[PDB]
Amino acid sequence: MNVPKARLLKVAELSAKIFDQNFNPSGIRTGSKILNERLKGPSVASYYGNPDILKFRHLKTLYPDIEFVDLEEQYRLSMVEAKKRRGKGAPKKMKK
Amino acid sequence: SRSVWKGPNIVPLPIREAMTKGTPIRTNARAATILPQFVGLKFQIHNGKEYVPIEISEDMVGHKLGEFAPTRKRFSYTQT
Amino acid sequence: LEEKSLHKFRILARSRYDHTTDIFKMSSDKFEHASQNARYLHDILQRLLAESKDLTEDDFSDVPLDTRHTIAKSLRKKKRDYEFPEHWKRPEDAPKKKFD
Amino acid sequence: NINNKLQHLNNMNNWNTQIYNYNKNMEIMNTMNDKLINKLLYKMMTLKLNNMNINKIIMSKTINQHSLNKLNIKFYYYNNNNNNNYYMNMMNKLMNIMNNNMNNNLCNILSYYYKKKVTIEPIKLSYIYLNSDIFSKYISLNDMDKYNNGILTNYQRMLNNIMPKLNDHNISMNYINNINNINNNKYNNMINLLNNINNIYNNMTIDNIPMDILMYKYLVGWSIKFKGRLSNNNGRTSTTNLLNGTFNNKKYLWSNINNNYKLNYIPSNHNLYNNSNINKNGKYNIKVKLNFI
Amino acid sequence: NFRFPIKTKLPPGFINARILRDNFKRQQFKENEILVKSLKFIARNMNLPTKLRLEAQLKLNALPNYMRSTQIKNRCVDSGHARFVLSDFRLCRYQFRENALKGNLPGVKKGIW
RNA sequence: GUUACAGACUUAAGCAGUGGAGCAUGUUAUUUAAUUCGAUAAUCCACGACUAACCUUACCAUAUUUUGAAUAUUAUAAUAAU
RNA sequence: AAACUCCAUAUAUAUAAUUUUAAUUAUAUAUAAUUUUAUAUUAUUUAAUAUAAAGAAAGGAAUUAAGACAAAUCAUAAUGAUCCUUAUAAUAUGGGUAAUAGACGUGCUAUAAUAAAAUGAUAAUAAAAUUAUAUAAAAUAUAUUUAAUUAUAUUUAAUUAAUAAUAUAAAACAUUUUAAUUUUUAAUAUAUUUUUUUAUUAUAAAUAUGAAUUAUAAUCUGAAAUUCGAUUAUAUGAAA
């Protein structure tokens, strides 16, 4: 490396001049670790809580004539009714 | 945040009004470099269930609020 | 680019320029639509050409061309520079064309 | 000498959700929607005609077929003279809510879920026994009481009494012989030219080849097991298997064709599924497996 | 009002209280991530004065827990499990095996090789 | 504590190890406000856990919520609108 | 059960304009062996043991039946029954899961010479795998005087993958060392061992192994390492 460091830094600055390059000769924290953070952010939103489904039921504002049956819901209702009948249902919520 | 830079830890505290009467400010947060600026008062530190009352010292500097507030109790014995 | 400017471009291009292939390659991944990225590279190359073809500030001829990146790249590259010795090549040993 | 594309199944079919996305993380999201979508579609198999009856339309698991160009989610459907003709009924109306109903239909709203062309393609069937999954389903939904206690002798018998014990050995031999004859005919025609396609294999056309080459078709042996709390008097389990016919293809035993494994764990010919339904006694799982040569 | 401080849609498919908590954090952090990044850059740039920086470091500590991703744990989208959660299928050591073996996951079967 | 075969790491070799030290672990016993819960011969014990600072988390202390995560019903009023 | 199956192996065809270059490859396909042929002893119509001779010929994986152990799971999920709805349901902050007399199981690192450590830039030599919830190369600054190595910090080249990055594989091989070891040296001379020889005087059970461990400073990540993470430098150097 028989080359003046000043010239070397000048070249680095020249690259900083050519390709939009951050020149940090000082080496002082520029927060660039954050400035360079251009990675995907709503990645979690892309999946997980992606909102766009027709929760079973949904079906009754568009297709009206058809009398559909949600089976799991019906079963649950039947179970609730059975519980009510045999005294094993559920005490009322204090409306406080 | 243990570093020469980013020093140290700012935990929002009623120190201001506390600095008046000195009211042991229930600093439940228990997670901050003992501020080296005010460095001086009295407060209780939530040890999981109870906030232990302590004041400021000539040792309590970098030491974090928690380092002075013990949580688990001491061990004991076998069966007999 | 001409000699002086050619060398200066390589000095300005730095790692982007591969001396072994003598090719200057760069990529753009900063804007939403690729069209904006394409214009970005066009401007960057035009900028480099303008600076390289003007040694008023510095010729950069004194600066030795950096090839460290390509040196490490060549280490990654796995090629066979050794071929069967020409003196070992013996046509008389090889059978002649056999007619059917 | 080669498994006709028609014979061997595609590995794509082995996967319920058929889609490939360089944007892998994205594709995970894609499949996620598929299964949840499958559930919603399923719930939409219920029917009503005024506190009269619920003609459950039996449905096969969504065979999601996603391919850039468009989406082709497909499922086989099953349900129970001079009336159904002049008036369409529920099922036909279901076909309507799918694609026939211009914009108010399903496939349409569906597009807002996959940013492509949603085309639902159901396929009707005439034999609840044709689809292993569907088989378990009907048994797990319609039957219920008919087995909740014991397996009604005739019910059991009817179950054991479906296909005429199709002789796999004989069927395999005939199929193998047919393949050899077709190959020999082509070989002879080729030799006649070896010494235009017209003569390249004349006498071979959409007749002696397209169906004789089909392999999986004959339910050689079928096994259905009622496993779970299916005993009113016995809290304990009551796994009741109904093994029928055999579970091996003799074509692979002595022919160029070799057995392939769906998902490299279950042979292609072997198809099986269990529809877990909760009985009043307790939840149960009816596993049904079909050899289907 | 709404159970969560800010009203949120409900995660499609399997819903769990732990999933709801994680989903709530995901929704909140997603929007706050930009602010989180802005203020942290502030606090960490020595090129600034201590006070402006401090003011910021402090606000962060004050920012609600939901404004964090370290708090978001990978949880099976189908079974609501946060243990042994492969992220390629966003599932779990079982729902995977199950879906993969059943064929629910296309191109995913058994490593017979 | 039975006549005779055969099989495999079953034993005899052989090599490397454990038991002996320190540490990391999982556990029992115990403590604690809590040390969540599960497995505990062979098949429990770097096992459920592919990672516990918070979150995860299930547990303890302290505050706080009560149609709440739905589905279906009863009514009043703001929002897109053919 | 076997067989088909998957990896893997031999060959053969097709593809790659040999700049995604690894054509010693990558696949799609086809064939192949659960090897065969021949003689000679034995036996009794034809199997075993030897011999040759033809071929590349050789493995692993997956699949673990019925039943039983009322084996494990109601904490993957789901569901019956039963128990609570102002609390056995939901949220925030802090704490806990990391507590320790003893005991067990499994590892790791160990106790030095048929073995450990520096060093080796015409970079000796690999497969498998990753990289749009990113990898992060060259350099550049410091720790430190050169330089290299090692660890962080500055800036992000290229690559979203047979392209570029993690990443020059390391052990082996060579040379140099190495406590006890007085097997050493270092001052002499001694000499056809010279990196060595010989004569004389000197050179009083944990080491230069071991890194448990303890202080201080520094760095990563994230609001936040305090109970409680990781890394390094200077120190410490138990046990074995």
Swiss-Prot record, chain A:
This protein's source sits in the domain of life called Eukaryota
Pfam families with a match to the protein in the record: MRP-S33 (PF08293)
Q: Basic residues composition bias: which ranges?
A: 84-95
- Keyword Ribonucleoprotein assigned to the entry: answer is yes
- Kindly list the places in or outside the cell where this protein is found, as annotated in its UniProt entry: Mitochondrion
Task: List the Gene Ontology MF annotations in alphabetical order.
Answer: structural constituent of ribosome
For this entry, list what GO says about its biological process.
Answer: mitochondrial translation
Cellular component terms per the entry's GO annotation: mitochondrial inner membrane; mitochondrial small ribosomal subunit; mitochondrion
**Record carries keyword Glycoprotein:** no
Q: Which UniProt keywords apply?
A: Mitochondrion, Ribonucleoprotein, Ribosomal protein
Tell me how this protein assembles.
Component of the mitochondrial small ribosomal subunit (mt-SSU). Mature yeast 74S mitochondrial ribosomes consist of a small (37S) and a large (54S) subunit. The 37S small subunit contains a 15S ribosomal RNA (15S mt-rRNA) and 34 different proteins. The 54S large subunit contains a 21S rRNA (21S mt-rRNA) and 46 different proteins.
Give the record's family classification. Belongs to the mitochondrion-specific ribosomal protein mS33 family.
Q: What does this protein do?
A: Component of the mitochondrial ribosome (mitoribosome), a dedicated translation machinery responsible for the synthesis of mitochondrial genome-encoded proteins, including at least some of the essential transmembrane subunits of the mitochondrial respiratory chain. The mitoribosomes are attached to the mitochondrial inner membrane and translation products are cotranslationally integrated into the membrane.
Protein name per its UniProtKB record: Small ribosomal subunit protein mS33
The organism of origin for this protein = Saccharomyces cerevisiae (strain ATCC 204508 / S288c)
Q: Upper taxonomic classification of the species?
A: Eukaryota, Fungi, Dikarya, Ascomycota, Saccharomycotina
Q: Which gene encodes it?
A: RSM27
Curated annotation (Swiss-Prot), chain B:
The cysteines joined by S-S bonds are none
A single Gene Ontology biological process assigned to it is: mitochondrial translation
Which Gene3D superfamilies does the UniProt entry name for this protein? 30s Ribosomal Protein S19, Chain A
Q: Which GO terms describe its molecular function?
A: RNA binding; structural constituent of ribosome
Main localisation: mitochondrion
Q: Where are the transmembrane segments?
A: none
Q: What does this protein do?
A: Component of the mitochondrial ribosome (mitoribosome), a dedicated translation machinery responsible for the synthesis of mitochondrial genome-encoded proteins, including at least some of the essential transmembrane subunits of the mitochondrial respiratory chain. The mitoribosomes are attached to the mitochondrial inner membrane and translation products are cotranslationally integrated into the membrane.
HAMAP family registered for this protein in UniProt = Ribosomal_uS19 (MF_00531)
Q: What is this protein called?
A: Small ribosomal subunit protein uS19m
Q: Which organism is it from?
A: Saccharomyces cerevisiae (strain ATCC 204508 / S288c) (Baker's yeast)
Report the gene name: RSM19
Swiss-Prot record, chain C:
Per UniProt, subcellular location reads as: Mitochondrion
- List other remarks: Present with 3150 molecules/cell in log phase SD medium.
Protein role: Component of the mitochondrial ribosome (mitoribosome), a dedicated translation machinery responsible for the synthesis of mitochondrial genome-encoded proteins, including at least some of the essential transmembrane subunits of the mitochondrial respiratory chain. The mitoribosomes are attached to the mitochondrial inner membrane and translation products are cotranslationally integrated into the membrane.
- Quaternary structure and partners: Component of the mitochondrial small ribosomal subunit (mt-SSU). Mature yeast 74S mitochondrial ribosomes consist of a small (37S) and a large (54S) subunit. The 37S small subunit contains a 15S ribosomal RNA (15S mt-rRNA) and 34 different proteins. The 54S large subunit contains a 21S rRNA (21S mt-rRNA) and 46 different proteins.
Q: Which family does it belong to?
A: Belongs to the mitochondrion-specific ribosomal protein mS35 family.
Q: Know the name of this protein?
A: Small ribosomal subunit protein mS35
Q: Which organism is this entry from?
A: Saccharomyces cerevisiae (strain ATCC 204508 / S288c) (Baker's yeast)
- The shown residues of the full protein are 211 to 310 of 319
Curated annotation (Swiss-Prot), chain D:
Query: What's one GO BP annotation on this UniProt entry?
Result: mitochondrial translation
UniProt-recorded name of the protein: Small ribosomal subunit protein uS3m
Q: Please list the coiled coil stretches.
A: none
Family (UniProt): Belongs to the universal ribosomal protein uS3 family.
Please give the start and end residues of each transmembrane region. Answer: none
Name the gene for this chain.
VAR1
The species this protein was found in = Saccharomyces cerevisiae (strain ATCC 204508 / S288c)
Record's keyword annotation contains Mitochondrion? yes
Q: Which domain of life is it from?
A: Eukaryota
| Subcellular localization | Mitochondrion
The UniProt subunit note reads as follows: Component of the mitochondrial small ribosomal subunit (mt-SSU). Mature yeast 74S mitochondrial ribosomes consist of a small (37S) and a large (54S) subunit. The 37S small subunit contains a 15S ribosomal RNA (15S mt-rRNA) and 34 different proteins. The 54S large subunit contains a 21S rRNA (21S mt-rRNA) and 46 different proteins. uS3m, uS4m and uS5m form the narrow entry site of the mRNA channel.
Q: What does this protein do?
A: Component of the mitochondrial ribosome (mitoribosome), a dedicated translation machinery responsible for the synthesis of mitochondrial genome-encoded proteins, including at least some of the essential transmembrane subunits of the mitochondrial respiratory chain. The mitoribosomes are attached to the mitochondrial inner membrane and translation products are cotranslationally integrated into the membrane. uS3m is essential for mitochondrial protein synthesis and required for the maturation of small ribosomal subunits.
Keyword annotations of the record = Mitochondrion, Ribonucleoprotein, Ribosomal protein
Q: Which GO MF terms does the UniProt record name? A: structural constituent of ribosome
